[PDB]
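Dissemination and training. As part of the outreach component of the grant, students in the summer workshop were shown how a complex can be specified as a set of sequence lines and then modelled as a single object. The example used during the hands-on session is reproduced here so that future cohorts can follow it. Participants entered these lines:
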Amino acid sequence: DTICIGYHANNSTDTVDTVLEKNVTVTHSVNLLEDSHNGKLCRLKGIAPLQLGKCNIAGWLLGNPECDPLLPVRSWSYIVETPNSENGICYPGDFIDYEELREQLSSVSSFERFEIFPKESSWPNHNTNGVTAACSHEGKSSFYRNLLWLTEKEGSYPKLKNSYVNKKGKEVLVLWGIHHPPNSKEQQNLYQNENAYVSVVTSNYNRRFTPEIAERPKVRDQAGRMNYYWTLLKPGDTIIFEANGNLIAPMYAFALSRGFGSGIITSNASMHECNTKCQTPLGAINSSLPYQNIHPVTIGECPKYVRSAKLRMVTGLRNIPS
Amino acid sequence: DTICIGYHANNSTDTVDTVLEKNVTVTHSVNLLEDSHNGKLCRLKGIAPLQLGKCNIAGWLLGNPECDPLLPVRSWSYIVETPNSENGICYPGDFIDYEELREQLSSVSSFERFEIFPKESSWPNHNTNGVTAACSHEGKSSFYRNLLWLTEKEGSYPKLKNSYVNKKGKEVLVLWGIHHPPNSKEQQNLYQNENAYVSVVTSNYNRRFTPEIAERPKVRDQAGRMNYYWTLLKPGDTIIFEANGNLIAPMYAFALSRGFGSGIITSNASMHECNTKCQTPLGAINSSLPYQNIHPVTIGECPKYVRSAKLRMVTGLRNIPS
Amino acid sequence: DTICIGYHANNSTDTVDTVLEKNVTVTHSVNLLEDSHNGKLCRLKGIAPLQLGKCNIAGWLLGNPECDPLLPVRSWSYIVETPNSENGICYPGDFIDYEELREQLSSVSSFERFEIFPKESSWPNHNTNGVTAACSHEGKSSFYRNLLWLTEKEGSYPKLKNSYVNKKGKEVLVLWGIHHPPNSKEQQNLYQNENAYVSVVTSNYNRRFTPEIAERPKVRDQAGRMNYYWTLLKPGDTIIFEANGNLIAPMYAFALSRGFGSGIITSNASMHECNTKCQTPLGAINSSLPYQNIHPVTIGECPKYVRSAKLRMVTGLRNIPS
Amino acid sequence: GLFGAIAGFIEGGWTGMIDGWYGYHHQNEQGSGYAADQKSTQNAINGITNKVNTVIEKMNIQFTAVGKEFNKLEKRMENLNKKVDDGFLDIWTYNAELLVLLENERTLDFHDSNVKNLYEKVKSQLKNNAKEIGNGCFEFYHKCDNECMESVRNGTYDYPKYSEESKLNRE
Amino acid sequence: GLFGAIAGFIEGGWTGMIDGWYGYHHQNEQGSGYAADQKSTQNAINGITNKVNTVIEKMNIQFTAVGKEFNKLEKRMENLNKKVDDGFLDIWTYNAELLVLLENERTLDFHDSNVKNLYEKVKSQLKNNAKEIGNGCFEFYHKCDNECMESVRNGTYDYPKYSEESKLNRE
Amino acid sequence: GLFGAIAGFIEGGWTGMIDGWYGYHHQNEQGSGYAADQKSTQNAINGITNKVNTVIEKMNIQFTAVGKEFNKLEKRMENLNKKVDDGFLDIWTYNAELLVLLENERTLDFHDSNVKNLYEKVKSQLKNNAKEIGNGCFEFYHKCDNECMESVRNGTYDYPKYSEESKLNRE
Amino acid sequence: XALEYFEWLSX
Amino acid sequence: XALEYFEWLSX
Amino acid sequence: XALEYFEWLSX
Ligand SMILES: *[C@@H]1O[C@H](CO)[C@@H](O[C@@H]2O[C@H](CO)[C@@H](O)[C@H](O)[C@H]2NC(C)=O)[C@H](O)[C@H]1NC(C)=O
Ligand SMILES: *[C@@H]1O[C@H](CO)[C@@H](O[C@@H]2O[C@H](CO)[C@@H](O)[C@H](O)[C@H]2NC(C)=O)[C@H](O)[C@H]1NC(C)=O
Ligand SMILES: *[C@@H]1O[C@H](CO)[C@@H](O[C@@H]2O[C@H](CO)[C@@H](O)[C@H](O)[C@H]2NC(C)=O)[C@H](O)[C@H]1NC(C)=O
Ligand SMILES: *[C@@H]1O[C@H](CO)[C@@H](O[C@@H]2O[C@H](CO)[C@@H](O)[C@H](O)[C@H]2NC(C)=O)[C@H](O)[C@H]1NC(C)=O
Ligand SMILES: *[C@@H]1O[C@H](CO)[C@@H](O[C@@H]2O[C@H](CO)[C@@H](O)[C@H](O)[C@H]2NC(C)=O)[C@H](O)[C@H]1NC(C)=O
Ligand SMILES: *[C@@H]1O[C@H](CO)[C@@H](O[C@@H]2O[C@H](CO)[C@@H](O)[C@H](O)[C@H]2NC(C)=O)[C@H](O)[C@H]1NC(C)=O
Ligand SMILES: *[C@@H]1O[C@H](CO)[C@@H](O[C@@H]2O[C@H](CO)[C@@H](O)[C@H](O)[C@H]2NC(C)=O)[C@H](O)[C@H]1NC(C)=O
Ligand SMILES: *[C@@H]1O[C@H](CO)[C@@H](O[C@@H]2O[C@H](CO)[C@@H](O)[C@H](O)[C@H]2NC(C)=O)[C@H](O)[C@H]1NC(C)=O
Ligand SMILES: *[C@@H]1O[C@H](CO)[C@@H](O[C@@H]2O[C@H](CO)[C@@H](O)[C@H](O)[C@H]2NC(C)=O)[C@H](O)[C@H]1NC(C)=O
Ligand SMILES: *[C@@H]1O[C@H](CO)[C@@H](O)[C@H](O)[C@H]1NC(C)=O
Ligand SMILES: *[C@@H]1O[C@H](CO)[C@@H](O)[C@H](O)[C@H]1NC(C)=O
Ligand SMILES: *[C@@H]1O[C@H](CO)[C@@H](O)[C@H](O)[C@H]1NC(C)=O
Ligand SMILES: *[C@@H]1O[C@H](CO)[C@@H](O)[C@H](O)[C@H]1NC(C)=O
Ligand SMILES: *[C@@H]1O[C@H](CO)[C@@H](O)[C@H](O)[C@H]1NC(C)=O
Ligand SMILES: *[C@@H]1O[C@H](CO)[C@@H](O)[C@H](O)[C@H]1NC(C)=O
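and obtained this result:
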């Protein structure tokens, strides 16, 4: 009559690493490293992402005609750009403080595109039919949907001074442009004044612009430039434009609302009818694991990103079926 | 006859956590997490803090009349601002590079407020009695204690060109202002020149200012602005002002000395007759413990801030009185 | 007859620290902390460093005559500056975006110094013999090797407009200067126009400069200034200069190629005929150890820098020869 | 192992015992069979569960973290941002791999320790009424039915009850 | 524990022993009493003291660290600064909690180990002149006065001195 | 140690044994001599080698990291950069020193454990044919030539072969 | 989380 | 620091 | 790396 004391062995092939010995077969274990994703763009906690399609941030904000127009009011959980955004700034020029604007948009959750300065008529005695070939649409020469090219009417460019009072109850992003002709001849043929100026002022904002005439290398078949500027009009505040030439006036502005846990990503994936608490540019992660080696860029409640290819923790014993 | 081998048990109720088992009662232990403070503003290693009272950095530097004037020379260990600093920039305008100036002040240990350009007479043939309602004091319309509003005298604003040579043996912070009237009428009625300019130059500094006339939304009942500028005059160097209008000239400048371990905090607490080696916005920490969960902002020799609510290390044994 | 079980003891005096007990003599151990260097400046993976000698980055880029001229084309692994670089900006003025330029140079691996605008003749009807005492060489008054001081010729300064097309197949760093005279008299005696201007434009770059006349404190016996500007001309792009005065025109530009693992250091050491995979300002590290306490600044494949003075790991047993 | 039990003087594990981590295998006249020890098993389960949970808990939820953009004149800030991201990444990968390794070692050693502890408990319960035939087994110096085996398993062995018979057979 | 001593085959601790962590409790004709072992206690004290000191020392003094301010056109730098602060905070909280847990486990296991070591030392000193009555106690096969008890305590037990008497009583 | 072997009931190490970490020292009629146990030694070597390699591997190669420059109006960014560098430095120094300490402790304890394991293995192999004379030695109750000593060393001791003689000498 | 490794655990 | 837990420690 | 501490190791 005999009795023995022994331990559990099963049939698992799970291998873990230790400090003294690598690659040890054990009976039970758990994996703390998530490496799987569905490769889809999903809703985040019930809210669909804002897809810009062919446009990037700049192209959408300015109103590139080549991009399919969005609904007037939109709400999202995160913003998506396509890697090959061919549509952006279609008229050559520098977009000032563009990156800071992106950062501002990273905490924005909703927008309302409204007509701040109606085409007819906020700028009397000026021509608002200005178009260009660089911003073409359906073959024809066109222009930004949100901006307006105020030129000379009947051989004169009268000094305009208009203003908007923000009664939306939210921040109002306002964008405008400043045109820079290559020569003084065009400057006169467009704005009739070689000494033009544009003045934009609010409570906290204050800037003056001057036409800089210079022959510049052809970009998109344009030797002239067009610098783009923006500001955030606080609720109740008033924005004032006052110019006598070279002003690419605003037409549509954006009413913005702030939200948390949002951001911008550059993804190649497509939108599916699905939902997740964690989203990466490669796809959605559905996991409660503490780590993930999929992608550094994460939006929502996600595991921490690491470079590890294996994180397996042992729970059972050293498996010895022999 | 028998003998036994056993271990110590006492009567402690101290509980610690381990990796295998949480909440274990032990005989002896030590707490490494400090969670107590006296809720007072104290001296730091023998030096009292600089309290700005009603003013913030801007308000004190410019010389807001609503704030109780400090002693001409002051030395401190850290700077304290009140959360509800109602007194700051009292005449609407942008304070340029304000944050960098704050950062500079974070390593300053002492200041000497001296009269760099005496009111009478450094600016002959100009009026120095200019006041405003936005910077009011005791009901009456007043102005900054450190600045001076040079206007037109007897229907003319002669071009002034003055300079100061730094013989203090330390850095000299010099602040000045540039006025921006809403219309050209006021511009003429104040400085007699529609084409005014202000030139400020040192060895390493070089800037020119131009009056920007534009109707701006009313801020503190003022449609005009006043941009504030500053510079650090190196020992031995010379600062030169040269203007024909719109100059809010300097009157008092600051002689600065650099120190270590200083900083700025926003605290609600009050100054008491006490001393500490570690100071937080909530109060002073008197501890040699390695960690603290009180506040992230610390000045002096302090424990490291963590989010932990309990850090107890076991020294004794597992307490079993049974 | 007896048998014993025992462990190895030898004769080592190697001491290690543990958590329970410091300073324990053991039989075998390994040191993971490298603390030795050869105190020499060596080649990095077969490529010699770019030594600027007496000049710093600014002095070399502008072309300070006091520094020994380098070969037209140079390739390096890292850039070295001497702590006491007495030769830099020899004509007083602000070098705009200098630090960003340094950062750009940190990823540059090679340069080709070529003549973008030949002295004779790219600027007809203008004097190119302008020199100064501040940039002296061999006692005589001289000027930058890469720049040219265009002045008035025969009592007139005709508007010049020249341009260069980049057909090097690489980025082309182009530097120029803008002169600022103390008074209008000198301004006229040099450029004949009190209303001068300089226009520099490419595809992506666009800047206009205006002479700012002001009496400034003497720096290197000069009351006038000279601001230095730069740009990176993309391959295929065209840079255009167009001025009527105050232009310190370019003469030599740099064709640049990008590389990895490069950087700038300030070292006091000397170049020897040796080679290394890791370089510090104090000297080269030849080690496979994971840590080093020599210097925080490292170039190449180096151990991680720590503040530790001893990192010894035990491998053998507790040595008891008794 | 560290305590010399598992893969030590007890060479292999029992595929037969499927109801627990540690246990017994008895052999008497009534028959033979495996039977896990539920107490030690439960303790080990609780400990390791708390360990795992404790490792998952120490890692907070990684909320929204997206990249930023910088223009051609902000290369410094760009490289700084990269420095930050890369640094944090290195540190966390390091911490993860290291912690997992350490906890694995400690886990295996913990199992080993548990087995040795159980064995010593049984041994101290039986005393000199049985002999260590090696391989973590005991041969009885008397007859032991299922009731006796159960008395051994659940920690209620009666030594003086079989002391006489055992002494006789021991001779 | 890990070594099965504390809360193992020695179920409870002695509230009576107030002069040390580890020790003895003797019972003979002259009387009964507790008496701590000063050597092992001192060693443990030194070790744990060095551990604690070693944990406090590894943490440098946190000098002045205050926040910074950013205008409406520097949101990026602001969020970067926050990234940095938050990151460092996470890392340090992690390290703290983890280290404390690990060191606690190792500490308890260290105590357990010390107790078992002492017990084994005593056992190896006494040999077969006494019997293990369980619960970490030994019953003598001879008479043991306070001098003998002291001889056992301070590691100077004389085995052949009582060998005969013990053999006789053992029968 | 933690297992009470090294610097415990085996007070000192053998300078005589120069071919291995753990081993034996025999004494019989044919003579006396040291002889290391190659198996346990090899295992320990493999383990510690993997540990060291594992510590060196966890640290990536530190590539090019140079300082940056900031003008008089960028003190904030400068101090931020410094914050970053200093923070990372603190963290890594901390991690290094801590890890080295921990691994050292675990290493010494590992050696101790190995020695005790070997001793217990030998003891369990010999059983009652020899007696523990303390200090990790066994005195034979019979004659043991070099062949017998070798039978003990390489784990092939024949107990019933000398059982009779041992029983007789034990009396 | 729970390790449901045996059907009688207490989890 | 010292752990003065017993009055005879050596600390 | 290898710890060549004895001449017969397997390394
Ligand atoms: C041994 O483990 C394997 C898993 O590697 C088991 O395979 C599973 O068997 C069950 C039912 O027997 C199936 O439902 C699963 O589909 C199989 N695969 C997995 C991944 O679970 C196998 O059953 C085990 N055998 C024994 C005897 O334990
Ligand atoms: C890690 O362990 C695995 C066992 O899981 C080893 O894989 C063995 O590989 C050999 C050689 O191909 C096969 O004969 C065995 O059948 C494999 N075992 C199993 C269960 O798959 C593997 O070699 C080990 N790797 C390292 C580097 O240690
Ligand atoms: C048990 O521990 C408690 C502490 O929780 C002791 O209470 C202290 O008793 C002393 C004197 O006996 C007083 O001076 C203290 O004010 C009490 N509180 C504290 C916090 O120390 C108690 O004395 C202990 N009793 C025994 C028998 O050990
Ligand atoms: C942690 O341990 C404490 C013991 O210190 C537990 O508190 C016990 O709580 C129960 C239920 O209220 C009381 O009956 C005991 O008297 C308490 N003990 C003491 C000494 O206060 C507590 O429940 C434990 N907490 C957890 C979550 O484990
Ligand atoms: C004890 O260790 C010392 C090292 O501290 C050994 O000294 C070396 O001896 C060898 C040859 O015996 C020489 O080649 C070396 O130059 C000596 N120094 C070093 C640093 O290795 C000494 O040999 C050892 N002695 C014994 C008996 O082990
Ligand atoms: C660390 O251990 C060393 C032993 O290596 C100690 O140095 C001993 O110092 C004493 C006093 O000078 C000398 O008598 C010994 O000969 C030294 N030993 C050796 C081998 O050099 C040293 O004191 C210890 N340091 C600390 C602080 O523990
Ligand atoms: C533990 O084992 C002891 C011995 O087997 C058990 O004692 C038996 O219990 C049953 C009840 O089903 C009695 O009818 C038997 O007569 C008992 N045997 C003896 C020795 O009298 C005991 O019940 C078991 N349970 C526990 C928890 O101890
Ligand atoms: C340790 O214990 C041994 C035994 O009690 C002590 O030996 C006694 O010491 C006293 C001195 O006070 C002698 O007069 C007794 O006669 C000794 N007893 C014996 C056996 O002769 C010894 O003194 C104790 N001290 C140490 C440090 O060993
Ligand atoms: C291990 O030791 C046993 C006992 O010494 C060895 O058995 C001897 O082996 C030799 C071969 O050289 C035989 O000729 C002897 O007759 C054997 N002795 C006995 C007991 O018969 C054995 O060879 C050794 N080797 C291994 C790996 O076990
Ligand atoms: C998605 O984009 C990646 C580049 O980021 C490219 O490698 C891949 O081919 C694309 N895949 C699809 C399906 O578009
Ligand atoms: C996520 O995974 C869990 C685990 O299977 C599953 O229960 C859940 O349905 C999944 N959720 C989604 C939305 O796929
Ligand atoms: C101090 O300020 C805090 C806000 O930071 C406020 O909650 C609190 O009420 C104030 N307390 C006192 C005493 O002023
Ligand atoms: C700080 O605390 C220690 C501990 O009681 C005390 O000795 C010291 O007086 C305290 N210091 C002050 C200034 O309160
Ligand atoms: C090198 O420079 C250092 C200052 O960084 C100075 O201390 C040292 O004297 C110099 N040594 C030599 C040899 O030039
Ligand atoms: C670096 O050190 C190793 C170790 O001695 C040596 O083999 C090698 O030659 C050294 N390399 C150089 C270039 O000095």
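Chains F and H do not touch (no CB pair under 8 Å). Students were then asked to discuss how this feature might be tested experimentally.
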